[PDB]
Every structure is written in C-alpha cells, then in structure tokens.
Design an enzyme around this catalytic site. Sequence first.
Site, short mmCIF file in Angstrom:
data_model
loop_
_atom_site.label_atom_id
_atom_site.label_comp_id
_atom_site.label_asym_id
_atom_site.label_seq_id
_atom_site.Cartn_x
_atom_site.Cartn_y
_atom_site.Cartn_z
N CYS A 230 38.51 31.21 90.20
CA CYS A 230 37.79 31.22 92.09
C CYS A 230 38.34 32.86 92.20
O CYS A 230 39.35 33.49 91.94
CB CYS A 230 38.84 30.84 92.83
SG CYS A 230 38.47 31.47 94.50
N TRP B 45 34.39 31.33 102.77
CA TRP B 45 33.10 32.00 102.75
C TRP B 45 32.12 32.24 101.75
O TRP B 45 32.91 32.52 100.26
CB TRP B 45 33.10 33.18 103.95
CG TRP B 45 34.09 34.55 103.24
CD1 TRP B 45 33.65 34.75 102.22
CD2 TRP B 45 35.31 34.40 103.31
NE1 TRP B 45 34.93 36.01 102.57
CE2 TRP B 45 35.98 35.62 102.99
CE3 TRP B 45 36.62 33.66 104.42
CZ2 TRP B 45 37.13 36.13 103.16
CZ3 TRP B 45 37.70 34.62 104.47
CH2 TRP B 45 37.59 35.58 104.03
N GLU C 280 26.62 33.27 94.66
CA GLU C 280 26.34 31.47 94.68
C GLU C 280 24.39 31.19 95.18
O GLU C 280 24.49 30.21 94.58
CB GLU C 280 27.41 31.55 95.29
CG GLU C 280 28.90 31.68 95.11
CD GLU C 280 29.97 30.69 95.75
OE1 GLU C 280 30.01 29.89 95.57
OE2 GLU C 280 30.56 31.66 96.47
C1 HEM Z 1 37.59 32.62 100.87
C2 HEM Z 1 36.64 33.82 100.42
C3 HEM Z 1 36.37 32.84 99.31
C4 HEM Z 1 35.35 33.28 98.46
C5 HEM Z 1 34.75 34.83 98.20
C6 HEM Z 1 35.92 32.87 97.03
C7 HEM Z 1 34.86 32.19 95.55
C8 HEM Z 1 34.86 31.52 94.85
C9 HEM Z 1 33.20 32.32 93.78
C10 HEM Z 1 32.58 32.09 94.01
C11 HEM Z 1 33.56 30.14 93.24
C12 HEM Z 1 32.37 29.74 92.25
C13 HEM Z 1 32.25 28.82 92.62
C14 HEM Z 1 30.86 28.16 91.34
O1 HEM Z 1 31.04 29.21 90.39
O2 HEM Z 1 30.14 27.01 92.11
C15 HEM Z 1 35.07 30.30 93.58
C16 HEM Z 1 35.87 28.34 92.76
C17 HEM Z 1 36.41 28.20 93.49
N1 HEM Z 1 36.68 28.37 94.80
FE1 HEM Z 1 37.55 30.06 95.75
N2 HEM Z 1 36.72 31.55 97.28
C18 HEM Z 1 37.13 31.58 98.25
C19 HEM Z 1 37.50 30.09 98.93
C20 HEM Z 1 38.70 29.54 98.08
C21 HEM Z 1 39.31 28.42 98.70
C22 HEM Z 1 40.12 28.50 100.53
C23 HEM Z 1 40.20 27.59 98.06
C24 HEM Z 1 41.26 26.14 98.15
C25 HEM Z 1 41.96 26.44 99.04
C26 HEM Z 1 39.31 28.09 96.96
C27 HEM Z 1 39.30 27.84 95.58
C28 HEM Z 1 38.60 27.09 94.67
C29 HEM Z 1 38.35 26.55 93.74
C30 HEM Z 1 39.80 25.19 93.43
C31 HEM Z 1 37.79 27.22 92.36
C32 HEM Z 1 36.87 26.46 91.63
C33 HEM Z 1 35.59 25.57 91.70
C34 HEM Z 1 35.01 24.21 90.26
O3 HEM Z 1 35.62 24.58 89.17
O4 HEM Z 1 34.12 23.94 90.83
N3 HEM Z 1 38.12 28.63 97.14
N4 HEM Z 1 35.52 30.29 94.58
N1 LIG Z 2 32.92 30.19 97.45
C1 LIG Z 2 33.65 29.62 97.97
N2 LIG Z 2 34.39 29.21 97.97
N3 LIG Z 2 32.41 28.63 97.00
C2 LIG Z 2 32.79 27.18 96.26
C3 LIG Z 2 31.72 26.81 95.48
C4 LIG Z 2 30.44 26.74 96.40
C5 LIG Z 2 29.50 26.53 95.50
N4 LIG Z 2 28.88 27.53 94.18
C6 LIG Z 2 27.75 27.27 96.58
O1 LIG Z 2 27.13 26.95 95.93
O2 LIG Z 2 27.95 25.79 97.31
#
Ligand code: HEM
Ligand SMILES: NC(=[NH2+])NCCC[C@H](N)C(=O)O
Lengths: 401, 402
Positions: free
Chosen positions: A105, A277, A282
């Site tokens: 993340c 968000w 993405e």
């Molecule tokens: C608040 C704004 C947030 C942003 C900008 C953000 C951004 C991102 C991005 C760009 C990814 C890569 C996703 C992909 O390529 O499919 C990701 C993955 C992830 N995020 Fe964040 N995220 C946010 C919030 C959160 C929150 C609230 C949680 C959990 C409470 C979280 C937990 C995770 C986890 C577990 C992954 C790995 C998902 C996977 O393995 O497919 N994120 N996030």
């Molecule tokens: N910014 C995030 N919290 N992303 C969670 C994964 C979302 C996923 N990459 C999508 O394109 O729908």
Amino acid sequence: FPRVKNWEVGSITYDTLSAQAQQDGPCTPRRCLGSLVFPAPEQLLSQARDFINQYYSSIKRSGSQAHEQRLQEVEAEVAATGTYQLRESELVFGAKQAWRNAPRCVGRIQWGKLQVFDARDCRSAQEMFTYICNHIKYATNRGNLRSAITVFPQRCPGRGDFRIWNSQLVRYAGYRQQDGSVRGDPANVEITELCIQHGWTPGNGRFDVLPLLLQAPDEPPELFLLPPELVLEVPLEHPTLEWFAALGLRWYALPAVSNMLLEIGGLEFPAAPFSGWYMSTEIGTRNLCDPHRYNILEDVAVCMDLDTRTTSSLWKDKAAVEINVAVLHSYQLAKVTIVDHHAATASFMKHLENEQKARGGCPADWAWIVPPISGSLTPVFHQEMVNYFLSPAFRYQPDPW
Amino acid sequence: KFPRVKNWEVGSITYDTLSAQAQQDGPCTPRRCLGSLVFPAPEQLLSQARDFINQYYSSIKRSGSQAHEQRLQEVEAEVAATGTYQLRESELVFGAKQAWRNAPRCVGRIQWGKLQVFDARDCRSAQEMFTYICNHIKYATNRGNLRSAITVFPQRCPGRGDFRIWNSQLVRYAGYRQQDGSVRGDPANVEITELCIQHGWTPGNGRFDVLPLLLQAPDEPPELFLLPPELVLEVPLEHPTLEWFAALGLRWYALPAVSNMLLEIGGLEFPAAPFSGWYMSTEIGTRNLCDPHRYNILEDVAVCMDLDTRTTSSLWKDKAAVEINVAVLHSYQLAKVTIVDHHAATASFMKHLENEQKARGGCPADWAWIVPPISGSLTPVFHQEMVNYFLSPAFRYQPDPW
Ligand code: HEM
Ligand SMILES: NC(=[NH2+])NCCC[C@H](N)C(=O)O
Ligand code: HEM
Ligand SMILES: C[C@H](O)[C@H](O)[C@H]1CNc2nc(N)[nH]c(=O)c2N1
Ligand SMILES: C[C@H](O)[C@H](O)[C@H]1CNc2nc(N)[nH]c(=O)c2N1
Ligand SMILES: NC(=[NH2+])NCCC[C@H](N)C(=O)O
Ligand SMILES: [Gd]
Ligand SMILES: [Gd]
Ligand SMILES: [Zn+2]
C-alpha cells in the site's frame, strides 16, 4: 540489520524492524520470488500475548496494572472458550496496524486516520448488507472520501465464515461473448457468472455495477442489489480532447477491497472490507489500459491520430498519459477525492521517514509501490525497500467457492 | 518443488526448474526480501571448472565424448600442478556468451548468441590495454551500426596484481563539482573525474566532456589515456516538433560499454573484461537525462513546452519525460546509430523468456531492472512474474580498485 539506501539523495538507513518479522515470505538465499503476486490454544495465546504487548507498548502502558490484567483476561477466555474477544479499542488499533503493516500500500501516510465500523454482532446476510450500505455511504461522503473498514464476526470453530464473495464492493460486470471475448471488465467474469447462477438478471453494458453476493455462516450466498444512489461514479472527460467524453468511459469513486482477511492477535476476520480513495494510475493505467482489462489504449491512440505502426513514436506512452490526465481531470471536476502518482509517492517517502523514527523501518514491496507509468520520475523508484510480514495484517485468502 | 511462475496478461504458467541449479546465494531470506537492493580453494575451483567444462560439452552436443573426458582430466591435472588453469579459446567464447545469457538485470538477452569476443589474455601493459580498448570501440561502433562485443583481458592469477579499468564505462562524461555543491556535467562521474584530475588530466569545463581512460596494468599505478575524438561517436539531441529542444545543447554517446564488472567463468576471474551492446532509449532519455541526481533536465524541458509545473496533477513530468524519450529515439535514428525503444526491447525479452523455458527450463531475471523506468505496465514484462537467481558463468560487481 539490512542497510537500505536512497539513490537520489545518497541517504542510508538500517531496517531494524525487519528483525521482528512474524511469518516467512517466499524468498530463499538461492532465489528471489519478490515479483510473484501470490506466492491450538498454545499458538493462539502466543499471538494474542504478542498483540496485547504491542498495543500496551503503543499507548505507553507496558507493564502497567491494566496491561497485566488484560493478559490475564485473554488467558482465561482462551482457556475457557478456545478463543477470545477484542476490546473495541484493540480492534481499532489492530485494524490501523494492519493497514500500517501492508507492504503493497502506497497510501500508508494516512494509516492513523481510519473509521472502524464494528460489525462483530452481525447475524444475517441481510444485516451484512445494511452494514455494507452504511460503510459505502460514510466512506463516499458525497465525493469527499473517508477511509473506513467494517469488521464482521471473527472466524470460529464449528461455524462457517462470513464472506463477501465479490473482490470489491463496487465492480463492473464482465460478460463472456460467443467468440471468447469479454464485454465489460475481464477481471470480473467469474464473479459475474456466479451472480447470474445465484439468480441475477445480467445487463449487457460495459460498466454494469455488480450485485453483492453475501455469505452468512453455513448458508449459501445471498444476492443483494446496491441502490444506484449509493454508488457514486465519474464519467470520464479530457480537458482539451473534446471527443474523449464521447467514448463513454466511466469509473466508480470508492475502491473498497472486500476479499482479504484481517488477522489481529491470532484472531481471523474473513470479512472485513476496507476502502480509501483512488490513486489515479489504478484507474487510468491499470484498469483501463491493461491488455487483460478494458484494454482501451489503442482506441485512444486512434482518436489522437497517433502513428501506431511503429513503437518508437511512443504512441502507447502518449495515449496512456492522456488517459491518466482524463481520470485526474474528471475526478477533480466531479469533486471526488483522487491522488496522482507523484503526490502519492511523495507522501509515501514522508511515511518511510516517519516510520524509520517510529519503528526503525517499514515493510514495503517495491514492485507494487512504484507506479505503473513514469516509475523513475517518482522518488520511490530510487528508494531501496525491505519486504517482510508483520502482524496485525491483511492477508489473501482462498475464494469461498 | 520448483517456483510456479505466472504471466498475468496471458494467464500462462511455467515452472522455473533452472533455479534449482543456482550456484551462489542471493541476499533474500524467508524472513525478508532484499530484491530491490542495488548492491546487496583447489577443491572449489575444481568443482566450478568441472561444472563449466560440462556446460561447454553439452552446449556443443558432445557430452560424454573422448574430447569431453580428456578436457576434464587435463583441467584437474593443471589445477593440481599449477593451482589454476587456462581456458581454450572456444571455451572463452562460450563462457562470455553464457555470462551474458545468465545476467538477470539485462533486458537485451535475446541477442546473447551474437557476441564478438576479443581475446586479450596476452596483454602485457596499460599501453596495450589501450590498444585493445580502442580496437573494441572501433569494432563495436562500426560507424553507428553497432555490434555487441567483449574484450577479455588476462585472468586474475596469484603473485601478480590485476588488470583493471578504473572507469565505469569506456565512454563517460566528466562531472565537475562546483563550489556551491552543484555539478557541471554528469554527477554520476564526479569521483572518476576527480581521480583523472589527480592523475594528471587537465579538465575541461563543459557538460559533455568525454573522460580519459585510467588503465591499470598489474602492480602498476593507473595510467591516463585520451580517447581520439574521432573514435567516440556522439549524437546531438533534437526533437522532431519541439524546435527549441536542439538549443539545449544536449548530446549523448553511441556506445554503452560497461568496463568495471568482473567476468567469472569456471572459477576463473577476469577483473577487466569490458562489454558493449547498444542503448535502450529509456537509459538515456529517462535515467541519464531526467534522474534528479543526473542531468536533471525535466523541469526546464517542461517549462519550455509551456506546461503547468505548478501542480503535479497536470502530469507535466510525464509529458516532458515522454517527449525527451521521443527526442532520443529520433536523434539516434537520424544519426543512424542503433537504438531500441523500451517497447521493442521488452517484447524481444518476452521471446527470450520463451526460448529459455524450452532450452533450459527457466531464466534468471530481476524484475525491478527489467521493467523500464517509464510506462512500466504498458510493457509485457511488467505482467510477467520472474525468478531471480545466480548462475555461472557470470558478470559480477567488484570493488573499485582505489
Ligand atoms: C486512503 C487512501 C489510499 C490510497 C491512496 C491507497 C493506495 C493504494 C494503492 C495504489 C494500492 C495498490 C493497489 C493495486 O495495485 O491493486 C494499495 C494497496 C493496498 N492497500 Fe492501500 N490505499 C489507501 C487506503 C487503504 C486503506 C484504508 C487500507 C486498509 C485499511 C489499505 C490497505 C491496502 C492493502 C492491504 C493493499 C494490498 C492490496 C492487494 O494486495 O491486492 N489501503 N493501496
Ligand atoms: N487506492 C486503493 N485503496 N486501492 C485498492 C485497490 C483498488 C484496485 N486497484 C482498483 O483499481 O479498483
Ligand atoms: C545488444 C544490445 C543490449 C541491450 C539493448 C541491453 C540492454 C540492457 C539494459 C537496458 C540494461 C539495464 C542497464 C542499466 O539500467 O544501467 C542492461 C544491463 C546489463 N547488461 Fe545488457 N544490453 C545489451 C547488450 C549487452 C551485452 C553485449 C552484455 C554482455 C556481454 C550485456 C550484459 C549486461 C549486464 C551484465 C547488465 C547489468 C549491468 C549492471 O548491473 O549495472 N548486455 N542491459
Ligand atoms: C508480475 C508482477 O509482480 C505484477 O504484474 C505486479 C507488478 N506490480 C504491481 N503493482 C501494483 N500496485 N499492482 C499490481 O497489480 C502489480 N502487479
Ligand atoms: C532502488 C532501486 O533498486 C533502484 O532505483 C533500481 C531500480 N531499477 C533499476 N532498473 C534498471 N534497469 N537500472 C537501474 O539503475 C535501476 N535502479
Ligand atoms: N544497453 C546497455 N548495454 N547498457 C549498459 C549500461 C548503460 C547505462 N545504463 C548508461 O546509461 O550508460
Ligand atoms: Gd479525424
Ligand atoms: Gd513545433
Ligand atoms: Zn526476494
């Protein structure tokens, strides 16, 4: 302790936190598998004690009376019941830590700001739906997105799990055609077919929002339609290419991952959907331009009159950049929270700095943190990273079918 | 038992059985992955030599032949008598190509079988090193129709110091540190620039001054040699539709020739063995020109393009970087100097992965280095899972000789 270098600045740190790594990853001294996407009362008590110690340390009350009392409480519950229950404050801490610990993340600068909905008293798929709708309403907040997680009852012996079958709360259907092609989102063909199997009347559009398939313990999943007024979407337009809007592209506001398992102190929550968000790549790069997703890159290049008969014109790169511009422009125009890849990566660098002081390191997966376009134009490309597993955590889990 | 590897674009799955033959340890453990880090006797020599001789005889389909057995015996006898051994010329050629084939950070490996190998194992002085290097450059450059080449200087041997080329590449631009801390020229080359000056070089004061060579013969201090300017082919950079771009006065050199790595073959070590191919355009357009710690031209280009540099969400960085890469490709093509774009290169690498799966059952590859630094997911390699491991023959990093 691994020495970790930033190549843009030449600064050096040591990740002492990695020494605390709970579970093992897929790599060995003989070969690295870092680029792969998917590589007992006694044990439970061990994890529960580790977690309680962690929590009491975080609030500066290690070895307090309250600390020792809590440890005794947990020991007694497990001895009596074979499991234990988290206090609400511990659930909140655990959910934030799991986010904090997520190596993939890039948005973790926000980790301390998370609304945690306690749905541990949920009993029916019908009530699961109510909780999910409330989550969506809150998190969406008319476009001013707020990070949130809803936690459904933990896994327990002699009872089936609560599960959300959908990979996200909002997803577009993908319909298999007679020729083998897909209309809509190819990533969701399987879930689309399951929805149809369980009685859903399919649309035939490119952006049909899927119903939810919700599983209460030991029941077959139940089908629920999301009220359209709850699902905020953004039609895509471009600030200077007037024809872009006519392509009829759109995306939804709320990325709400619903298929991962939340682990806290040895307890497991197979249903705990979370949302934040979007980062714009993405949508603009992966969801719309991946060859195995909507795959619209060449359509856009045709409309831009680019020379698609030689790779060296860099037509792919130009088309992709304009699609990302359209996503950012459209979300801002619609007043829906979105962050571009430059801002997100800069905030992540700040996060790394905060975590070095706080904990002596930060688990991070370089291949996932570096954005899928303009990689080396972002500071994270130049930052060495150490990937390891800490708990509390979000884990992948098998599909419930 | 073997790593299962998926391609996500296509859904295809293979098993990397070659990884089980990994010959040295990498930096990862089950507790933590260090994959993103840049820089993480007779009995052993004999085991490595026998493995290599076996690779060689298999390569030519003569495994088990009388020739195969004779060579094994000869090597074991030579090691017993002399503490080391000498490669036959044909083994050296095979070994150099295998080391290229085995290099996990090289995306250009579709070409591994086409390599010109110059045998300089008879070299006796720094002056003679310079002769070999000049001939390498002339051959490899070929007036812009680049040909891949390696020159192999004498191996490490007891009682004698190493041959070393102090420069990190045969052609590099000087980096002159200014008083205020800034750099004129290439900041990557500040150290080698200062060493050249320490060793008697009269510096220039431009942004693109080609460095002299510091060449070290065994047990001698390094000696300074100037490259004849007629030998160093350069490309002035212009953009096909942004006419002011040419006025930036940018240029780059035709030949990428890495000269500070160690070539290891059958337990033998060659600390001086410079190799060259041709450029992939993102090396120049994205890394060399746009890295904040290199020439760092991105903002100036963006401002001249009249982009809004006030906010990141206009994607001015991305737009300017793409146009700089366009300029590199256009300029090399205009100058008739071989270059490959990152799309063509990554597509050819996918073909190489396919060839290697059939030939050897896998291919060591470092995902972070293979995926280009712009437009990553627009290339097929982004979607390809990879297994990183060390096979020998190999190109290896080595400490700087100063
Ligand atoms: C608040 C704004 C947030 C942003 C900008 C953000 C951004 C991102 C991005 C760009 C990814 C890569 C996703 C992909 O390529 O499919 C990701 C993955 C992830 N995020 Fe964040 N995220 C946010 C919030 C959160 C929150 C609230 C949680 C959990 C409470 C979280 C937990 C995770 C986890 C577990 C992954 C790995 C998902 C996977 O393995 O497919 N994120 N996030
Ligand atoms: N910014 C995030 N919290 N992303 C969670 C994964 C979302 C996923 N990459 C999508 O394109 O729908
Ligand atoms: C023929 C055209 C070739 C192309 C297009 C090509 C492409 C590349 C690229 C893009 C890199 C990454 C370099 C960086 O980011 O600094 C690389 C690295 C590398 N290449 Fe190739 N290459 C070619 C020829 C060769 C040859 C002839 C050899 C050796 C005989 C070779 C061996 C290596 C090695 C050892 C590395 C790792 C360098 C390092 O770790 O700094 N390549 N190549
Ligand atoms: C094979 C490779 O690991 C895979 O394509 C990864 C690369 N990096 C990624 N990074 C992010 N953020 N999301 C992804 O889905 C992927 N996919
Ligand atoms: C920290 C990170 O490993 C470093 O910036 C790497 C990333 N990938 C790279 N890939 C290539 N081809 N060349 C490089 O110099 C780098 N640098
Ligand atoms: N294509 C190659 N053979 N590259 C070797 C490394 C060259 C280095 N990346 C440079 O920009 O000078
Ligand atoms: Gd037209
Ligand atoms: Gd123009
Ligand atoms: Zn690893």
